[PDB]
From a paper:
IF2 is the guanosine triphosphatase (GTPase) that guides the entry of the formyl-methionine initiator tRNA (fMet-tRNAifMet) into the peptidyl (P) site of the ribosome. In the small subunit (30 S) initiation complex, IF2-GTP holds fMet-tRNAifMet in a specific orientation and provides anchor points that accelerate joining of the large subunit (50 S), resulting in the formation of the 70 S initiation complex (70S-IC). Ribosome-stimulated GTP hydrolysis in IF2 and inorganic phosphate (Pi) release is accompanied by a series of conformational changes in IF2 and the ribosome, leading to the accommodation of fMet-tRNAifMet into the P site and IF2 dissociation from the ribosome. Initiation factor IF2 is the largest translation factor in Escherichia coli with an N-terminal region of variable length across bacterial species and a conserved C-terminal region that encompasses four domains.
Local refinement of this region yielded a 2.8-Å resolution map of the N2-globular sub-domain of IF2 interacting with helix h16 of 16 S rRNA. An initial model of the N2 sub-domain was generated with AlphaFold237, and then fit and refined into the density. Using this approach, we traced 85 additional residues (248 to 332), of which residues 266 to 312 form the three-helix bundle sub-domain N2 in IF2 not previously included in the E. coli 70S-IC structures. While structure alignment of the three-helix bundle N2 sub-domain of ribosome-bound P. aeruginosa IF2 (residues 266 to 312) with the NMR structure of the E. coli sub-domain N1 (residues 2–50)38 reveals reasonable homology with a root-mean-square-deviation (RMSD) value of 4.9 Å, alignment with the N/G1 domain from the crystal structure of ribosome-free T. thermophilus IF219,39 shows an almost perfect fit with RMSD of 1 Å. The overall shape of the N2-globular sub-domain complements that of helix h16 in the shoulder region of the 30 S subunit, with residues Ser277, Val278, Lys279 and Arg259 forming the main interface and the extension that emerges from the N2 sub-domain wrapping around the minor groove of h16. In the rotated 70S-IC (II-A), the buried surface area by extended IF2-GDPCP is ~5146 Å2, of which ~1173 Å2 is attributed to the N2 sub-domain. In the 70S-IC, the additional interactions provided by the N2 sub-domain further anchor IF2 on the ribosome, explaining how this region of IF2 stabilizes the binding of fMet-tRNAifMet to the P site of the 30S-IC and promotes joining of the 30 S and 50 S subunits. In the non-rotated 70S-IC the N2 region of compact IF2-GDP is not visible, indicating that the N2 sub-domain disengages from the 30 S shoulder and becomes labile upon back-rotation of the small subunit in the 70S-IC. The region of the N-domain of IF2 proximal to the G-domain that interacts with the 30 S subunit was previously called the N/G1 domain in T. thermophilus IF222,34, and shares high sequence similarity with the distal region of the N-domain of E. coli and P. aeruginosa IF2 (sub-domain N1).
Author numbering: 248 to 332
Write the structure that this text describes.
Amino acid sequence: HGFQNPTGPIVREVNIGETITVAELAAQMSVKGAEVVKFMFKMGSPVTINQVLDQETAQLVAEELGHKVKLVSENALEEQLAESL
């Protein structure tokens, strides 16, 4: 069980709330914020470092960069106590 040097890139489990600042999105993918800003500039909508993004854009860009998105909701108990009846 020794060290096997990884070959491919890295993938993270990006947890996305109801909204997220692009700084936190860059933090959770282990990429620098400037790279995320330049990437969004390359395709359409420009951003700033502390601009707030919504579910659709954040999930689309994060899943495009290769990471797996695991989004969550702020009313969890409400659906929890809705499949019980």
